[PDB]
Amino acid sequence: DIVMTQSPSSLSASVGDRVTITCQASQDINNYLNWYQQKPGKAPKLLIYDASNLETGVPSRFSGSGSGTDFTFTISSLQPEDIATYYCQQFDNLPWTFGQGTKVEIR
Amino acid sequence: LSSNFGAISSVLNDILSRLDPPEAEVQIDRLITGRLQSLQTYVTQQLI
Amino acid sequence: LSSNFGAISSVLNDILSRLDPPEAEVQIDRLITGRLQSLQTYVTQQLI
Amino acid sequence: CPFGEVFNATRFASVYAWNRKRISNCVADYSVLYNSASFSTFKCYGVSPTKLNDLCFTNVYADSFVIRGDEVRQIAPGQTGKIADYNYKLPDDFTGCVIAWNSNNLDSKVGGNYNYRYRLFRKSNLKPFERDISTEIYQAGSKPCNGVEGFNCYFPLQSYGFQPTNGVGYQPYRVVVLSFELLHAPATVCGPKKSTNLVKNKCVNFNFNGLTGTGVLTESNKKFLPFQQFGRDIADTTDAVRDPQTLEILDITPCSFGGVSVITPGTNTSNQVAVLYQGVNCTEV
Amino acid sequence: TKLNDLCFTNVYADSFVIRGDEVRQIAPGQTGKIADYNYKLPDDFTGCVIAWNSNNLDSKVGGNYNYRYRLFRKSNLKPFERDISTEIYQAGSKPCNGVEGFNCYFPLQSYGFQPTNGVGYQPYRVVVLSFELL
Amino acid sequence: TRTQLPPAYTNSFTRGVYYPDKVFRSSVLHSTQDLFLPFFSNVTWFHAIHKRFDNPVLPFNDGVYFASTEKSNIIRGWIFGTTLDSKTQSLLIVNNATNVVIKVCEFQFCNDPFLDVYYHGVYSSANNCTFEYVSQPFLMDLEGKQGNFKNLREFVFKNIDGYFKIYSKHTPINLVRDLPQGFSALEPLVDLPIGINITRFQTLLALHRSSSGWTAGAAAYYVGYLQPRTFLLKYNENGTITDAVDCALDPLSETKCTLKSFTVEKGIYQTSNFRVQPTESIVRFPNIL
Amino acid sequence: EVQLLESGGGLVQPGGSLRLSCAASGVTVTSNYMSWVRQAPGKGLEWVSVIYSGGSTYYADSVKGRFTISRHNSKNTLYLQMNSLRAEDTAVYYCARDLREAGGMDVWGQGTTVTVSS
C-alpha cells in the first residue's frame, strides 16, 4: 500500500560538515517518525524522538523540524561518532515497505 | 404462520440472510417442511 | 419416487455404496420417512 | 488407465494455471490404488471415495495445483475462502473430492518462488469451470486505480511466497481435485466387472452400468432412434434396454405380479390349509 | 438492505475521533494497536462502522492537540470492556508519584490533528454501531 | 473497403425443437426446463449478396442457433474466443464437408480473416498450445442439386456446466418464399469436455474459385438466441417428437403446460398467480427521531 | 531484573527444523507488542514478523507461514519454531519490543546468527 522512500539515498561529507536529511512519506504521517542510529555492527539505537526534544546523550548540534508529511533533520557539526545510517519508516500500515536510507559517512 | 414448528423463528425472511445460501436454502426448506405439514393438516381437517 | 426431498440421489443402490452405513442408513431412513409421509397423505386423501 | 500418471506425477502446477488429467476409455480398479496410504490428506464428504469400481462415472478429472493447506480442509459444501472465491471455485453440488500433500521443501526456488500466482481480490463470485483471465482491477478507494497500483489499489496478480520455512499448518500443499458428472451419460470405465448373457421369459434383475431393475427381458418390437441408450413407457418406468456389447433392444416387464394370501378353515373344524399367490402366473408349481 | 427492518433491542453507538486510515482497521475480529488498549470489537460484532472527515473543524492552525488515545493497559481487551483508570502504571520498582518518566507513564497521548494531514490521515469522527440481539 | 449492410431480422415460428437428453421416450407428454429457442422469436439473418463484405460477430453467453439454407455450402466453420489474438487461445472449428477439425492454439489470424483458398489458409504457423482434435470421418450428402435451395443445416452449441455440446440437424428441405416453415428435432452430435468458457464467436465466410485473385458467390445464414424456458414434448407411437410447446409464450401455452395435455376442452382453469411487483421499497423516518 | 537473551541456530543441514528462544525478564509478554527482525551480515535492517497481545500473529507475504509460535509463563519466554529453514535466511535474528507512539524501540536485544548454508 504505502511505500515510504527517503528523498536522499547516499550522502557523503567530512567531519564537521552540515548534513540535511529529508524524510518524506507517500501521504501525511504524524507522531510515527523516529530518528535512529544503527551504526555498523553494533545494535541499533534510537536517538531523536518527535523531532523536537533532545534525548540524553545526543549533542545539541543535532536539530529536527517539520509538522506534517516532510520532516527535516540538520547536523551542524558532523562527528566520527555519527558514522551511521538513518532510517525513518512508516510502522503503521503493514506490510512495512523499506526506505532508501540516509547513509552518512565521514571523510 | 406465526408458529415456530420447532424452527428458529416464524419469519421466513431472516434465515435467508443468516446462513450461507447453499445451506440457507435448506434451513428455508425446513421452514417449508413445517409449514407444508401445517398445510397438510389444515387441508385434511378442512376436507374432513 | 422422482421426488427426493433433499436426497443426493434417487437410485436405491447409489446411496448405500457411496456413504458409510452410519450415514447412508440414516439417509435412507429419512428418505423412506418422506415416502411414508407421502403414503400417509395419499391414504388420508384417498380414504376421505 | 494411467494409474500412476494422475497422483504420482513428478511436478505439479500452480493455482493460476493448474494442470488437468483425464481418465476415460480404459479399465480402472481403484481399490488397490486407494489402499496405499501415500497421500497426506484425502477428503470426501458426500460422494464415494472408494466405490469408483462399483458405481463409476464416464469422465474422470484430476485438477492439480498448489494452494494453502488451511483452506484445503475448508473445501467442503457451504464453506468459502480466498481461493474458493477467486482462484478455484466449485458448484453447489460439487461431485468430487480433494487430495493434498505437503511439498514445501521441493517447490521452492533459490531466486524466489514466483512460479505460483493468484488473484488477490474479486468483486463477485466465480462461474463454474471459469478461470479469472480478465484484467479487471479491483477498486477499494474512491480514486480510480488507473489499471495499476496506487492509493488503496493493488494488482490482482500476486506471487505466493512459498518457502520451506513455513509451518506444518501453513505450508504449501499440492492439491488434486477429483471431478466427474453423474446421471448425465452412460459411464464407460468401471471396476473389474465380468459380465454374462441374458434370458427371456424368466424374470431376473438387471444392472446395466448403474441402471438397476427387476423384471422379464422380453422381445422389443418398436422402432427406435439410433442414438438411444434406453427408453421409458407411460408409467415412468424403464421400458426398454440395450445391451452395451451386442447392440440389441429388449423390453422390461416387472416380475412377481402379486402377493400371498392364506385360505384357512377354523382350527376347531380342520387344519388343512390352501394358499393363493395373488395376481401372478404360477412359477414354482 | 435489511438493516432498515431488523429488530435489535439495543444499538451501542460509540462516538469518538481518530486518524483517517485507522477506520478500516476497526473490523470484527481485526486486531491492531487500538484493538488491545482502546477499543476492540467483539468476535461476533454484528453492526456497522461510520467515519466522516472533520478536518475543517477539528484541526487548528497551531495544532489541535485536544484529542488523546490510550497506550497502556493492565490487561488485554475483552469483548466490550471499558478500562478508564487514570492511575499511572508501575512497570518497575520506581514509585510513580503522579509524574512522568520511565515505567511511569500516563497512558494518554495527544492526537496530532492538524490541517496538514492528508485525506487518509485527517481527523475522522467515527461512530461504531453494535447491534444487540438475544 | 469494409462496409456493413443493415442487420436484417427475421421471425422464427417453430424452429429449435430437440431432445433434451440422451434418454428416449415413447407415447409421453413430458416437460423439461432447458435452454431453447422461444417460439416466434428474433433471428439475425445476415447476407452476402450483391466492398460489400460483412463481418458479423455475436456473443455466446447463453447460446445461439446457426441455420444455413443454401446449396454451395460456403460457410464452413466458426472462430471462438474473446479477442482472437495471442492473449487468449482461440478456438477454430472447420468442417470441409468430410470431417471436423478443432484447434485452440496461437493462430495469427489476419486483420480481415476469411477462408481464402487457391490451387483449385487462415494461419502461417501454429504452436504454443495443448489442445487439438480431429473428428472421425462421416458421410455428408455431397450430391449436387440444381434450381431452388434444397438443403438445411442447423447447429446448436449448449453449455452444460462448462461442457460444450454441439447438436446438429442436416436435412433436405424445399424453400418456398424465403420464410422458414417446418418441423423436426435435433439429435446431439458431439461434446467438447474442456471446461473453458468462451465469450463470443465469428462465422467463416469463404472465397472459392474453380487480393484480386479470390472470388466467391453469394451466401446468407440465420442465427438464433436461446433462452432458459420450459417446453412440453409430445411423443408418438414411433416415439419421435411430433409436437413441442412453450410454457411462457401465451396463456394457452401456459394452460397446456400446466395440464400436460394438448387437447383442452371447455372450462375455467388456473396457470399461475398474478402479483404486482415491488415497485418501490418504503423506509420511513420521523421528520425534523 | 530486565534482561533479554536469545538461543537457537548453528550450522545444521538445509531442510533442518530449528527453534529460536527469546527469554525476556522484567516485562509482560502477554500484554505487549513484539516483533522478529532478521539482519544480513553487513547490511541494514530487515523486518520479518509481528506478534500482538492476545494471540494474533502476522508476517509479510513472503513469510506468510514461516513461524509456529508458543509461549511459556514459567520464565516469561517465547519459543518459535521453523520447519525446514531456508538457505539465504542465514542472518542475525532479533526479538524486539516496541513502545510505539511514546518513543519507539530505543534499545535492541542480543541477536543470534543462524546459518542454513549447504
Numbering used by the authors:
A (entry chain J): 1 to 66, 66A, 66B, 67 to 105
B (entry chain D), C (entry chain C): 966 to 1013
D (entry chain A): 336 to 620
E (entry chain C): 385 to 518
F (entry chain C): 20 to 69, 77 to 146, 158 to 247, 255 to 332, 335
G (entry chain I): 1 to 82, 82A, 82B, 82C, 83 to 100, 100A, 100E, 101 to 113
Provide the publication's sentences verbatim.
JE-5C, JH-8B and JM-1A belong to Class 1/2 and their footprints locate around the ridge of RBD, heavily overlapped with that of ACE2. The antibodies showed varied levels of neutralizing potency against Omicron variants BA.4/5, with three Class 1/2 mAbs, JE-5C, JH-11A, and JH-8B, being most potent with half-maximal inhibitory concentrations (IC50 values) less than 0.1 μg/ml. They also retained neutralization against Omicron BQ.1.1, with IC50 values of 0.43, 0.14 and 0.43 μg/ml, respectively. But JH-11A was the only one with high potency extended against XBB.1.5 and XBB.1.16 (IC50 less than 0.1 μg/ml), while JH-8B had slightly reduced (IC50 around 0.2 μg/ml) and JE-5C had much reduced activities (IC50 over 1 μg/ml).
